[PDB]
Amino acid sequence: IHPF
Amino acid sequence: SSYTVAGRNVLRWDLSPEQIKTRTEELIVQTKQVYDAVGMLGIEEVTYENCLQALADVEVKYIVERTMLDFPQHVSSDKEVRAASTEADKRLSRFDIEMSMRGDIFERIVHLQETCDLGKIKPEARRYLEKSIKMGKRNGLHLPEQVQNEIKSMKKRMSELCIDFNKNLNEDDTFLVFSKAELGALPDDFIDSLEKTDDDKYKITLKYPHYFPVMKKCCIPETRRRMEMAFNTRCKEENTIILQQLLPLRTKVAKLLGYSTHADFVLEMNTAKSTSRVTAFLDDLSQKLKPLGEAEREFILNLKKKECKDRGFEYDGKINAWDLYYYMTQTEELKYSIDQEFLKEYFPIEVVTEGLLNTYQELLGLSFEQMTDAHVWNKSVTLYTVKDKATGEVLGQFYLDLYPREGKYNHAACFGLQPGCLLPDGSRMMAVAALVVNFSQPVAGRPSLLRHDEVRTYFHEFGHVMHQICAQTDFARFSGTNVETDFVEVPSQMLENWVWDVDSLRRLSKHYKDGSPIADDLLEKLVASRLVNTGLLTLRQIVLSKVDQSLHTNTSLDAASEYAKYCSEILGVAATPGTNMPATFGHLAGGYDGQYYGYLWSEVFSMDMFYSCFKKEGIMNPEVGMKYRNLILKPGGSLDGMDMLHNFLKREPNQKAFLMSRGLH
Ligand SMILES: [Zn+2]
Numbered sequence: 144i145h146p147f
Numbered sequence: 148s149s150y151t152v153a154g155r156n157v158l159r160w161d162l163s164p165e166q167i168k169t170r171t172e173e174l175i176v177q178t179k180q181v182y183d184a185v186g187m188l189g190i191e192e193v194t195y196e197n198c199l200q201a202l203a204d205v206e207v208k209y210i211v212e213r214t215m216l217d218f219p220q221h222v223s224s225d226k227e228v229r230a231a232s233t234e235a236d237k238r239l240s241r242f243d244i245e246m247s248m249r250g251d252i253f254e255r256i257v258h259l260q261e262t263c264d265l266g267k268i269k270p271e272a273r274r275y276l277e278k279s280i281k282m283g284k285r286n287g288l289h290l291p292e293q294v295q296n297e298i299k300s301m302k303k304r305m306s307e308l309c310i311d312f313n314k315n316l317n318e319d320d321t322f323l324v325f326s327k328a329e330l331g332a333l334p335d336d337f338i339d340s341l342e343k344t345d346d347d348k349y350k351i352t353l354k355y356p357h358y359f360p361v362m363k364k365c366c367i368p369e370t371r372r373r374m375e376m377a378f379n380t381r382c383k384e385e386n387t388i389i390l391q392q393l394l395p396l397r398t399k400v401a402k403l404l405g406y407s408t409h410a411d412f413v414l415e416m417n418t419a420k421s422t423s424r425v426t427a428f429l430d431d432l433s434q435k436l437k438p439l440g441e442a443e444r445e446f447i448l449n450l451k452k453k454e455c456k457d458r459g460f461e462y463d464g465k466i467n468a469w470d471l472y473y474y475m476t477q478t479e480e481l482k483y484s485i486d487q488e489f490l491k492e493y494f495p496i497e498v499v500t501e502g503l504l505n506t507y508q509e510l511l512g513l514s515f516e517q518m519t520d521a522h523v524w525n526k527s528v529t530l531y532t533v534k535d536k537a538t539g540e541v542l543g544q545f546y547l548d549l550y551p552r553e554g555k556y557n558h559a560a561c562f563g564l565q566p567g568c569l570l571p572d573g574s575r576m577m578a579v580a581a582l583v584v585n586f587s588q589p590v591a592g593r594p595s596l597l598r599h600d601e602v603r604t605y606f607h608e609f610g611h612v613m614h615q616i617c618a619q620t621d622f623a624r625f626s627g628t629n630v631e632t633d634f635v636e637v638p639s640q641m642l643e644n645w646v647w648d649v650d651s652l653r654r655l656s657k658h659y660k661d662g663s664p665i666a667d668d669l670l671e672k673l674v675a676s677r678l679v680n681t682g683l684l685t686l687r688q689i690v691l692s693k694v695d696q697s698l699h700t701n702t703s704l705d706a707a708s709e710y711a712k713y714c715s716e717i718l719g720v721a722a723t724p725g726t727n728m729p730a731t732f733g734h735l736a737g738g739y740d741g742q743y744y745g746y747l748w749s750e751v752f753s754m755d756m757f758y759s760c761f762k763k764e765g766i767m768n769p770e771v772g773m774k775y776r777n778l779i780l781k782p783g784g785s786l787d788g789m790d791m792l793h794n795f796l797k798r799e800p801n802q803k804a805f806l807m808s809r810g811l812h
Contacts, residue, residue: 144559144607144639145688145746146732147359147600 148574152532152541155577158215158564160223160524164231167216171235174212175242181205186251193255195268199275202252204571207623211576213239214564221317221556222524222548222583229554233314240306248299250292253283271621271785278624285412287404294403301400308393309736315382316733317556322352323377325370332366334488336591353378354557355585362472364488368460375469379726386730390698390706397740398702410699410741417633417742418788425744426696432747433689433717435811439682444719447474447683468723475680483676487598490673493656493665496549496586496595499602502655503609504531506645510772511613511780512536518544525552533616543567543578543616550595551585558733559584559604561611561639566626567619567783578627580615582608594659599673602655603643610639617776618783625784632738633745634752634788638780641753647677648766678810685809686718688747691732693717695743698729706730751805752792758804759796 162170182205185198217239220232246252260276283289287298326348330338337360342350351357351374358378365371397409406412410422419425447466451474455462466474479485504515514534521530527550533542543565551557560583567578584604589595597605611628614635620626628635645651649670656665665673690713697709706729711722722728729735734743756775757766764771778795792800806812 144604145743146691146734147355 149540150538152544152577155541156544156565156579157211158579160215160219160522162215162219162228164225164227167219167228167231167235170212171216171238174209174216174239178205178209178242178246182246182249182252185255186249188255190255190258193259195259195263195272198255198259199272200571203275203622207566207568207570207576210623211565214562218562218564218581219524220314221562222528222581224525224552224554226554229318233310237307237310240310241303244299244302244306247282247286248288248295250288250295253280253288256280256283269621271625274625274785275622285404285416290403298400298403301396305393305396305400308389308396312386312389312393312736313733315385316731318554319353319381319557321377321381322350323373324348324350329367329370330361330365331370332364333361334364336593340588340590353381354551356551356587359472362469363476365473366454366458368469371469371473372467375467375723376726379468379723379728379731381731383727383730387706387727390729390735393736394698394704394706395702397699408700410696413632413741417631417745419633419744419748422696422700425748426693428748429689429692429696429744433686435806436682436685436689436809439810440686440719441682443475443478443680443682446478447471450474450477466720468720468726471683471720475683479676479679483679484669484672485599485676485679487600490665490669491587491596491598492660493658494597494599494602495657495659496597498657499597499605499655500547503605506651506654506767507609507613507642508536509769510767511617511776512769512773513542514539527552541577542619543580545580545582545612545616548581548583549586550588555585556583557585559608560737561608561615561628563615563627563629566623566629567616568623568626569621575619578616578618580612580627582612584608596659599646603646606642606646607639610642611635613642613776614638614780614783617780619781620783620785622785627783629784631788632742633748636745636749637752637788640746640750641757644753644757644761645766647674649674651766681809683718683720685747690714690717692744692747694729695735695739695741698735699741751802752800754805754808755800755803756792756795758808 181201185193185201188197216232216235218232220229220236223229223232256276256279260280265273287295324344327338330349338349344350351361353374358374361374362371401407401409401412404412408422414420414422414425419428444466447470448464451466451470452462454460476487479487507513508515512535514536516532516534518530518532521528523530523546525548527548529547530544531547532544534540535542548555562581562583563579564581565576565579568576570576586597586601586605587595615627618627646655652670652673653664658664690710693713694710697713698704698706707727710728711724714720714722734740739745760771760775761768774795779791782791
C-alpha cells in the first residue's frame with residue numbers, strides 16, 4: 144500500500 | 148496436474164550465496180540459447196511455433212528461475228544471501244535490457260503481425276504481438292543504431308540506481324536512544340519490549356512496529372521531533388545522489404524516444420492515458436478536500452494549544468511534521484471514542500487470520516489449507532494451498548510473512564513468485580504469491596495484537612494475493628498482477644471495505660482473554676470512524692502524487708525543495724528543514740515512478756464497484772463474488788483495465804460512489  | 152499439488156512448487160529457498168551466483172550464470176547461458184536461436188532464423192521462415200511460442204516458453208522458464216534469485220534479498224535473514232541475491236538482481240536486470248534491445252528479434256515479431264493470418268491464433272496471442280511490438284518501439288528499436296546503444300547504456304545505469312536505492316533503505320539500521328521519562332504516555336507493553344542500554348536507556352528502531360506507536364502516543368514533543376528527523380533522513384546522503392542521477396536520466400531516455408517528459412512516457416501504458424488528465428484529477432480532488440483540511444488543522448491546532456497550556460510547554464502556533472500523527476490520534480479518540488490500544492485486544496493475529504480466510508473462502512468460492520512442514524525461507528513463514536471450492540482445482544499457493552526481522556522488507560508488499568500461465572506441455576502452472584508485512588510481535592505474554600489499520604493492510608495485501616492466484620492466462624507477461632500500474636491497486640484497495648462492515652468485523656474479532664466480542668456501541672463507532680482525519684490523510688497522498696508528477700516533469704528541480712513546496716501548499720503542514728522524504732520514497736524505484744497517482748486513481752474504481760454491485764446485493768453474496776473473481780481477478784493482464792471494469796459494471800465508472808464515500812459530492 145502507500146507510505147503511511 | 149490442475150487438481151494436484153505435488154511438484155508444482157519448484158521454488159527452493161535453501162540456496163547458498165555460491166549456489167545463487169552459479170545458478171545465475173547458468174540461467175543466462177540457457178536463456179540466451181533460446182534468444183540466439185530465434186535471432187538466427189530467416190525473416191521469411193519465422194512461424195508461430197519457432198518464434199512466438201519459443202519466446203513464450205522461455206519467458207515462463209526465466210521469470211520463475213529469476214524469482215528464486217531476486218527474492219531472498221527481501222526476506223532472508225542471512226546478509227550474504229541478501230547480498231548474493233542483489234548481485235543476481237543487478238546481473239539479470241541488465242540481461243533483460245540486453246535481450247529487449249535485440250534488433251533481430253524485433254525485426255521478426257513485426258513480420259509475424261504483418262504477414263501471418265491473425266485469425267488462426269488466440270486473442271491473447273494477438274495481444275501478445277501488439278504488446279511485444281509496442282515494447283520494442285518503447286525501447287527505440289525502430290530508431291538508428293547509434294541511439295539504441297545510447298538508450299541501452301542509460302537504462303543499464305537506471306537499473307543499478309533503482310536497486311541501490313532500495314538496498315540502502317532495506318539495510319538501514321539507524322536507531323535512537325531515549326530514557327523512560329522521554330517516552331511519556333507510552334504503554335508498558337511497548338517499553339518493556341525494547342533493548343535496554345548500559346545507562347538504563349532504551350533503544351527504538353526506525354521501523355513500523357516502533358516508529359508509529361511513538362509518533363501516535365508519545366506526549367514528549369522533543370522525542371517525536373527526533374524520531375521524525377531520523378525517519379525522514381534515512382539514507383539522506385546516498386539516496387539524494389541517486390535522485391540527482393536517476394531523474395535526469397529518466398527524462399533523457401524519454402526525450403530520445405520522442406516523449407516530452409518521463410511522466411508522459413509511462414502514462415501511455417496506463418488507464419489515465421495522459422498526464423494532463425492526471426494533474427486535472429489531482430487538482431480538482433484537492434479543492435473538494437481543501438475545506439476539510441482546514442477544519443482538521445484548526446481542530447488539531449486547538450488541541451496543541453490546550454495541551455501545551457496544560458503541560459507547560461511552549462506553544463509555537465504551528466503544526467509541525469512530528470505533531471501530525473500525535474494529534475490525529477487524539478482526534479480519533481475524542482470525536483469517535485476509538486482507543487486503538489484497547490481495540491487491539493480484540494484483534495489477535497490468529498483470529499484475524501482465520502476470519503480473513505473464511506471471509507474470502509465464501510466470497511470467491513475457494514478452499515484454503517495450511518501445509519504442514521512447509522519449505523520456507525524462514526521458520527516464521529506459513530504456507531497455504533488454494534483450491535477452487537466447486538471443482539477442487541488447485542489454483543495456487545501463497546506464503547505468509549507477517550513479522551519483521553533483521554534485513555526484512557520494512558514496508559508491506561506482495562511478491563508474485565510463479566505466474567498462473569500455460570507450459571509448453573499443455574499443462575497449467577500453479578500460481579505462487581507471498582504476503583510480506585511487518586505487524587506487531589507477541590509482547591507481555593500476549594499473542595500478536597493488531598491495530599485496526601494493521602487489519603486493513605492485512606486485507607489490502609491479501610487482495611494482491613487473490614489477484615495473483617485467481618489470474619489464469621496463457622502467457623507469463625499477462626499473468627498475475629501484471630496489469631496497468633494505475634489499476635493493480637483495484638483488487639487490493641477494494642478488500643479494505645470488508646474491514647469497515649459491522650457484520651464482517653464481528654467475524655474478525657475475539658478478545659484474547661475472556662473470548663468476548665466487541666461491544667455493540669464500540670463497533671458502531673468504529674464503522675462511523677471511517678472518515679476521521681480523511682482530509683489530512685488524503686492531502687498527504689495528494690502531495691506525494693503531485694511530487695511524483697513534478698519530479699518527473701521539470702528537469703533541474705531540487706527533490707527536497709519540491710516536496711516541501713507541495714506540503715505547505717496542499718497539506719498545510721510544512722516539511723521539516725533538513726529532512727528529505729524523497730530519499731526514503733521507495734516507490735520511485737519500485738515500479739511506481741510517475742505512477743503513484745494510481746493509489747487514488749484506483750480507489751475511484753473500487754468504490755464504484757463496491758457500492759453499485761456489492762453493497763446492493765450484499766458484501767457476502769457468492770453471486771457477486773464469483774462475478775468479481777471471473778471478470779476482474781481471473782483475466783489479469785490479458786484484458787485492458789477499462790474493459791474489465793466495463794464487463795463488471797456494465798457501464799463506465801464514475802466518481803459518484805467515490806465522492807460520497809468521502810463525505811463530498
Ligand atoms: Zn497493494
